[PDB]
């Protein structure tokens, strides 16, 4: 299981990398834009925020297969081992096949359907990223799509991995993990909620109080 | 998983071969007729439309086993490695056995029942093609037939593959893939719908809008 | 159960009205456009083809609630008891509430989600029409949406009815009916497939054969 | 629950009417042909074999709606209260509507699909008869069709009844009854098997044996 | 079904009240605080934003039962028919019983468990509000809690209603409605997402395109 | 739903009666013994602790039906409307029938099996009390026993009620309530846990904090 | 998967051996009797009729274990590699154990229960043959018995195989195959129905029609 | 699967050993007591009735671990390879651990719960024997207990085997076998019922009858 | 399976170690604080009560990752091979990662959610301990959390083990074991209940009664 943070917040990544067992960081056009810093600036900073290790993901902007391949080359020139995110559209599929031939790892993104996702994997994508919350928000079932997609990859593209993305609540992430997703990327708020619980704090505080009351110390 | 297009539209095949990761093209008597071009003309053209690679399927027309075998020989003379489609009838089963003995790969077609499909595989067919939509249209359940057929081949004819065919909607294709079908052939309209989504286009548009608002351009 | 035909083909409606127990005819902008005849011409003809009885449905074209209400008035001036179809959008919802106040029956159309559909019923719509095949085509489950919608109306808007629409295969129609839909509208091809079966024709043939064999004739 | 015998065997009907609680007898073109006796002869004999009570069913032979209506009139002239069986085809549906208007009870027969069956009920048929075993024999599921049909009538045509027919084994009849069918017609062999059991005979024999051993006789 | 907006944004309520079929508005300490206007200012404005109709909900702040009852009286003095929200704590339960005796309608809020919720209903609360998203965020299942709570009220406190609250995505709201909740309150962002869909907008656009392609205009 | 406390702790009952919506208090030989106060002392005190209202339950000690009836008379002399608990044994069943004839309400207690419980209801018991935790502790499933018992009473003794007892955790109580139990009696620790939650306390504190920040006070 | 024909009709076996992929032929006392030819005549003819290759099954007639073993020897003297069918009775089990010691392959037949079937396998039988239709005819569930038996062999006698027999309809055969039966023997009528379908014949006809309409010829 | 007879009836064991594929015989204190013969007499006779082969089981009578180990030694002195049954009590568990160290095989008996059974296996027992019928008789579910125990051993004590015991009907034995029990011991009446069926006898008689009708004899 | 006792009661551990097949003992701050005895005294004593064998678990008290690592070192200095329990908080996760690098085995404790638990395993924890009863007490489902957690570890952290803790009843322990937990720690009362059953004691008594009635003694 590869755990990623979906952000362009360098400071947050450095801080959280010490807490979570991160595999890297994922980004998309909106996340980058929100950060205001250009790709040539943020990507290296993010890589550094992770001690120069881990995996990074960045998305192409072009609309034609040829343009997307050129975008991929540009991204790889910034981060040599970066994984290129390609929207799974007709041209996106064509680009994925071309990138597969060039040996550049890709992730099929903007996936709103299981069959669409499978096609990107069959075309060569190493990762397939369904937008869980967006599917949920638009009247579907993000979890069912993830479940169906995972089943499709398991029997039709065994080496491809589901990278679940787009979350508003920890429950969605939990369900994707229970569905078997090999990887997942979490926005900062959901990630924080996943490690902070009133019940846990109440238990721990109780342990700390009983111990201090019995041994007058805050350590073993 | 082997993805095929169910068509005799050479121009469309060339165009779509660049987008989809195609394993080849399947044809049947009605599709060929609709194209208006004879077999010795269209098959080579289709083969060329795929870059001289991929697998092709063509159907026999004879009603007797002997006649079907002769049809198979004629088809193989047009395309040396073509897979011969044989309707799964009493004479068809006899033809399939004969063709196995001759080493000519076959596909049991016109399958409307799971047991019927299994028999063609036991007779030697490498592929079994249930007519999903026709079963649905006639008051049955194309998906249940495919599910039952796949289970039968899995435990009784492991090397045989289900090649799901006859589709009116992407949902039928999705369900066949979720059922575990090793191969599938899609008509052009369903294939196009499978890669075109209003939600996906909206997401890409949003990404472009955010990118421009932060960088004054829509290019990477 | 209310059975409708989704068409603007007057001749076909007249012919099929003698076969199917029709409740009326439904139309939408595309169906009207494909017919080429204007509303003030086609609607009256459809009513006539229906023997002067039955229910008709026509859709508004305006984008604002005020405009939609005006469209509704125009439609009602053509067919006094026509049911006005309103796309379930923000403005559509506003229009539905206004039309409810005016006593003009409405149908919430262009429904791609169950909650969206329920909202139109809560706003006053007598019918809610999910686009089954479109939901299926776009990676969702038209049947699950219909099932969820029917459940929502059953417990939250008991007097509202689901009018299932958008079909490519009889199976989709069957599943909607099994889900409990109170009404359904079928395109001509699906309707025809629903009453034509090779197995049925064969049974009729065998009966005649046995009859002729015992009585030397195929008639009573 | 209306229990019928599917036969034209007058002697058998007379004998079995004393054993089973029969509602009447059903016939079809093949069953009549097998008996060799013409309609004007067997129908009255069957009515008599039923003690002059019960209900009878006979099938039309014509292919056009007009012809079927004429056949219905002829059948009613033989047996005044007979229920007319009409194959559920396009013309059959038209005939059913006409017969409803004329007040002649009908049964939609030769039903191989649930939707097809529902249509006959919506057209006016009092009974809908799916051919259970034929559906089973042709690769489908007669029981699922019956289950689906019963569900459709229950929610969309409450006063219509399913009259399950076509049986090769008691299990099929049991499953139709468990599905809720309001009526059923059994061929003579299945009916006999339904009341003859080795286990039952063994129990009865054991009771006689114990009684004999205690009271020196097998009589009460 | 009672549809509420969870907000203190008067302008938004006025605007959305013409779109959604609202039953009223719900508020809580954090929502009021975020709006900055005092209770005796915002409550009357919200009532106004809804044409002087609809139901309002406001929460007590006191920690003792006696104090909560006094808070309830104060709230009722601002809005005569307001429903008083009481956190379901030991003292909250006591307050609910006292308010039931005084005839002041209450809602048991801050519900994180089904049994806790049931207790508030047994104490007299007309509504029980589980915090769906918070339960989800804290490692539980908001939907299961809602499902369990609804069942408990259905069989043990039939007149009490579940008022589902705390949402981050439309899917949570849909699931609560499918669970049978009699009422629900939505934050503004989720409510807006529930009526805005790329697929719906695309369908409307297509309708307009076909209409103009046939009639030369997009109106009428 | 009747909510009871399973205790002989008068002070606790007085305190909790203002918090929980209690129907009364249940006792058994061990609970009374634990309290040390004799029956004719504690029962009146418990009745007073509840403000002179509510229902009380006390158990017989005799081993013969005649002795149990005498015990019942003695209990009724202490509390006129008390419900007499009778262990469901052979003699207990006999006593229950006798007490029904005498018009003294009974509860069949010490129930470890569903059939055993049903028998007590058929004999006349108004309540049947399965020992949920003891069944769980001894390798069975207290919840399944309660579920089975409730189903048995529902269809075979409609007026009898299940009074679920013996709890170590709130989850057991929740499951009994979800199973449909008409009544339940909780030991003090489980009852307290059912109304105290770290998550709830965390939420309430947050509301106070936000309120303070906006209005400079913690009061409404 | 071993497919057998349950018959003594030599001519039919010869004809069908060319169509179906047969593993051999099974016979029983009634089947042999129906053919009127003695064992020493039919068995040899069947061996050559099936293709000189394949497996044959014949049943013992003796009632004692010793007699059954002698019958087995006689059968083996007619067909050296024949599999001996032994009714699973007390003496039958004893015979199966003896034949196991002698190295003569056996099949436990006349199986009406799963446990009974398992016992024959534990005793040494290579095949276990439940009488599916007879179980169905006598008020049980042939399919459930087969399902249970297959499970028992799978976990308790892995090398034993279920040889499903006794069929009246293709559906029973399909269900046995779906249950995982390693072998099955079909009566001639069911076998023929399994390869003859009105829908399949119709598909072949339409293909021919479209073909000749476009190419002015019937041939490929 | 090890099949045992639960009895001390030497003559019966000798007779049935020729019919069933027995693994041996199990005994318990009550079974032995009923036989009236002491252990030093019956055990050797049972071993002899088994042809001097197979496995035997006998139970300790001591109540302390030390006493049980001494009892084990006494039993082993009678039958060198006997498996010692130890009731799964606290002292029994201690005894099982000691017997494991002493290399004497044990069976944890008197198991009324799954966790209890698991503990005996973890302590060293080779077999675990739940009392199926007693569990059923006492208001529980013997089959569920067996199912749970088998699951526990399968995942937590792989080398331990369930030896299901205590039966009143064949169905219980069948269900234990379907649950996966590796061994089972049957009382003589249940064993006999498992191999004697009216339906089977009828089938055999019919075969003999048909044979006679065709060959004038009932022998081969 | 690893069976542990959750206690600091040295005398009890010594006594129970002779009965249960223990893997060791687990402790937490509350267990230790209650004992008032320091860890450098209690741990060695528990280790000794275990015969100088088995695994021990002790919890850190520090609130920062650095402090927790120091606590771990101190614990390891008391018991060289002790497993260090770390509360799964943000700092706890950081500590687990650090301890993983130092080669000190850890257990992620105070787990109230499945995702939280998985994170501790992904960080390096060998064991993950959900507080089953506390989750149950706080309105959740301890068993569902354990089930979800086990599934997450099985597919995402295969070498990590669930160590179920916090029990009030044997049923909770049984369900955790049925869920597949690799380890479990029981408080003394639940452990004792798991090996003491009235039904078992009664069975032993009956055996003794029968034995004496037949042999004049209850021994041998």
Domains and CATH numbers, chain H: 1-220 (3.20.20.70)
Could you tell me the two tokens for B26? 């399947």
CA distance E203 to I52: 75
Q: Could you give the dihedral angle defined by the CA atoms of residues D114, D116, D122 and D124, in that order, rounded to the nearest 10 degrees?
A: -110
Q: Give the best residue of H28, H33, H78 to mutate against chain I (max I CB count within 10 A).
A: H33
Q: Which residues of D are catalytic?
A: 85
Q: Say if CB D172 and CB D194 are below 8 A apart.
A: no
Could you tell me the two tokens for C13? 């409606």
Within 8 A by CB and 6+ apart from F62, the residues are: F68, F70, F71
How many G×H Cβ pairs under 8 Å? 108
Could you tell me the two tokens for H48? 């002899």
Catalytic residue, chosen from F36, F37, F74, F85, is F85
CA angle B23, B26, B31 (to 5 degrees): 150
Q: Kindly calculate the radius of gyration of chain D based on its CA atoms and give it in whole angstroms.
A: 20
Enumerate neighbours of I (3 or more CB pairs within 8 A): A, E, F, H
Q: DSSP labels for E7-72?
A: ---HHHHHHHTTTS---EEE--HHHHHHH-S-HHHHHHHHHHHTTT-SEEEEE---SSHHHHHHHH
Alpha carbon distances (Å) from H133 to G115, G135, H168, I105: 18, 27, 7, 46
Say yes or no for a CB contact (<8 Å) between I33 and A214. yes
Within 8 A by CB and 6+ apart from B10, the residues are: B35, B42, B45, B46, B48, B49
Q: Say if CB F220 and CB E61 are below 8 A apart.
A: yes
CA distance G197 to G201: 6
CA distance F82 to F85: 9
| Phi, psi angles (nearest 5°) of residue G159 | -85, -10
Nearest residue to H76 via CA among H97, H105, H54, H48: H105
Q: DSSP labels for F35-101?
A: H-S-HHHHHHHHHHHTTT-SEEEEE---SSHHHHHHHHHHHHHHSTTPEEEEE-SHHHHHHHHHHHH
Within 8 A by CB and 6+ apart from F218, the residues are: E61, F208, F211, F212
Could you tell me the two tokens for A9? 């917040």
Alpha carbon of B20: minimum distance to chain G alpha carbons (Å): 28
| Phi, psi angles (nearest 5°) of residue E11 | -60, -45
Rounded (10°) angle between helices I39-49 and I65-78: 50
Sign of the Cα torsion G59, G62, G68, G72 reads: negative
Say yes or no for a CB contact (<8 Å) between G112 and H19. no
CA distance I220 to I207: 12
Q: For D118, which residue in chain B has the nearest alpha carbon? A: B139
Q: For H198, which residue in chain D has the nearest alpha carbon? A: D199
CA distance I203 to H138: 12
Q: Give the best residue of I110, I121, I146 to mutate against chain A (max A CB count within 10 A).
A: I110
Q: Kindly calculate the radius of gyration of chain H based on its CA atoms and give it in whole angstroms.
A: 20
Alpha carbon of H207: minimum distance to chain D alpha carbons (Å): 14
Q: Say if CB C152 and CB C117 are below 8 A apart.
A: yes
Say yes or no for a CB contact (<8 Å) between D113 and B145. no
Catalytic residue, chosen from E37, E85, E97, E168, is E85
Sign of the Cα torsion I85, I90, I94, I97 reads: positive
CA distance E116 to F177: 12
How many C×E Cβ pairs under 8 Å? 104
CA distance E141 to C201: 54
Q: DSSP labels for B146-211?
A: HHHHHHHHHHH-TT-EEEEB--SSHHHHHHHHHTT-SEEEE-HHHHHHTT--HHHHHHHHHHHHHH
Within 8 A by CB and 6+ apart from H151, the residues are: I178
Q: Say if CB D111 and CB D125 are below 8 A apart.
A: no
Q: For G205, which residue in chain C has the nearest alpha carbon? A: C198
Catalytic residue, chosen from G37, G74, G85, G100, is G85
Q: Say if CB F164 and CB F143 are below 8 A apart.
A: no
Catalytic residue, chosen from C37, C85, C97, C100, is C85
- Beta strand spans in chain G (E): 2-6, 24-26, 55-59, 83-87, 106-111, 127-130, 161-164, 183-186
Sign of the Cα torsion C96, C97, C98, C101 reads: positive
Within 8 A by CB and 6+ apart from B91, the residues are: B63, B64, B65, B68
DSSP C131: B
Alpha carbon of B105: minimum distance to chain G alpha carbons (Å): 17
CA distance D178 to E37: 65
- Candidate from B142, B171, B199 with C-beta closest to C142: B171
Per residue in F130-163, is it b (16+ CB within 10 Å) or e — as a string? bbbbbbbbbbbbbbbbbbbbbebbeeebeebbbb
Per residue in A147-175, is it b (16+ CB within 10 Å) or e — as a string? bbbbbbbebbbeebbbbbbbbbbbbbbbb
How many B×G Cβ pairs under 8 Å? 103
The answer to whether C85 is a known catalytic residue is: yes
* Beta carbons within 10 angstroms of residue I61's beta carbon: 24
CA distance E172 to A171: 10
CA distance E58 to E75: 7
Q: Give the best residue of B164, B178, B182, B196 to mutate against chain A (max A CB count within 10 A).
A: B178
CA distance B64 to E51: 81
| Phi, psi angles (nearest 5°) of residue F42 | -65, -40
| Phi, psi angles (nearest 5°) of residue D2 | -100, 115
Q: DSSP labels for I29-58?
A: HHHHHHH---HHHHHHHHHHHTTT-SEEEE
Q: For G201, which residue in chain C has the nearest alpha carbon? A: C198
Q: DSSP labels for A89-144?
A: SHHHHHHHHHHHHHT--EEEEEE-SHHHHHHHHHHT-SEEEEBHHHHHHTTS-HHH
**CB-based touch G/A (3+ pairs, under 8 A):** no
Alpha carbon of G168: minimum distance to chain D alpha carbons (Å): 6
Say yes or no for a CB contact (<8 Å) between D138 and G169. no
Q: Say if CB E23 and CB E183 are below 8 A apart.
A: yes
The maximal CA–CA distance of chain F, rounded, in angstroms, is 71
Q: For F200, which residue in chain I has the nearest alpha carbon? A: I138
Q: DSSP labels for H67-85?
A: HHHHHHHHHHHHSTTPEEE
Within 8 A by CB and 6+ apart from D36, the residues are: C214
Length of chain C: 220
Q: Give contacts of B148 with chain G, Cβ < 8 Å.
A: 174, 178
**Experimental method used, please?**
X-ray
Within 8 A by CB and 6+ apart from F43, the residues are: F27, F56, F58, F75, F78, F79, F82
CA distance F157 to H9: 46
Q: 3-state DSSP call for residue D198?
A: helix
CA distance D95 to D63: 10
CA distance E95 to E87: 10
DSSP B79: S
Give chain C's contact residues with A (Cβ, < 8 Å). Answer: 112-116, 138-141, 144-145
Determine whether E160 is exposed, middle or buried from the number of CB atoms within 10 Å of its CB (0-12, 13-18, 19+): buried
Say yes or no for a CB contact (<8 Å) between E204 and C39. no
Q: For C17, which residue in chain D has the nearest alpha carbon? A: D94
CA distance C34 to C48: 20
CA distance E128 to E118: 8
Could you tell me the two tokens for G207? 């293909």
CA distance F51 to F45: 10
Nearest residue to I138 via CA among F194, E88, F166, F201: F194
Say yes or no for a CB contact (<8 Å) between F199 and A201. no
Q: Give the best residue of C198, C200, C206 to mutate against chain G (max G CB count within 10 A).
A: C198
Task: Label residue C139 left, alpha or beta by phi (over 0 means left) and psi (-120 to 50 means alpha).
Answer: left
Say yes or no for a CB contact (<8 Å) between C116 and E194. yes
Sign of the Cα torsion F27, F28, F33, F39 reads: positive
Sign of the Cα torsion G32, G34, G38, G41 reads: negative
Resolution to 1 decimal, in Å?
1.9
Residues linked to residue I3 through DSSP beta bridges, in sequence order: I184
Q: Could you give the dihedral angle defined by the CA atoms of residues D124, D126, D128 and D129, in that order, rounded to the nearest 10 degrees?
A: -140
Q: Give contacts of C169 with chain B, Cβ < 8 Å.
A: 133, 136-137, 168-169, 172
Sign of the Cα torsion H47, H49, H55, H60 reads: negative
CA distance F206 to F209: 5
Alpha carbon of F178: minimum distance to chain E alpha carbons (Å): 6
Q: 3-state DSSP call for residue E100?
A: helix
- Beta strand spans in chain A (E): 2-6, 24-26, 55-59, 83-87, 106-111, 127-130, 161-164, 183-186
């Amino acid at each position: 299981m590869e755990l990623y943070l979906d952000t362009s917040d360098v400071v947050a990544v450095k801080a959280l990398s010490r807490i979570f067992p991160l595999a890297g960081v994922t980004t998309n056009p909106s996340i980058i834009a929100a950060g205001k810093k250009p790709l040539d600036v943020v990507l290296p900073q993010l890589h550094e925020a992770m001690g120069g290790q881990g995996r990074l993901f960045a998305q192409v902007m072009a609309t034609t297969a040829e343009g997307m391949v050129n975008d991929a080359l540009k991204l790889r020139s910034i981060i040599a081992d970066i994984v290129v995110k390609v929207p799974v559209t007709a041209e996106g599929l064509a680009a994925i096949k071309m990138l597969k031939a060039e040996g550049i790892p890709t992730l099929g993104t903007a996936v709103y359907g299981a069959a669409q996702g499978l096609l990107s994997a069959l075309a060569g994508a190493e990762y397939v990223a369904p937008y869980v919350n967006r599917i949920d928000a638009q009247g579907g079932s993000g979890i069912q799509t993830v479940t169906d997609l995972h089943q499709l990859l398991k029997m039709h593209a065994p080496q491809a991995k589901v990278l679940a993305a787009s979350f508003k609540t920890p429950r969605q992430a939990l369900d994707c993990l229970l569905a078997g997703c090999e990887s997942i990327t979490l926005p900062l708020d959901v990630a924080q909620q996943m490690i902070s619980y009133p019940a846990v704090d109440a238990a721990v505080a109780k342990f700390e109080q009983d111990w201090q009351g019995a041994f007058g110390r805050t350590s073993i």
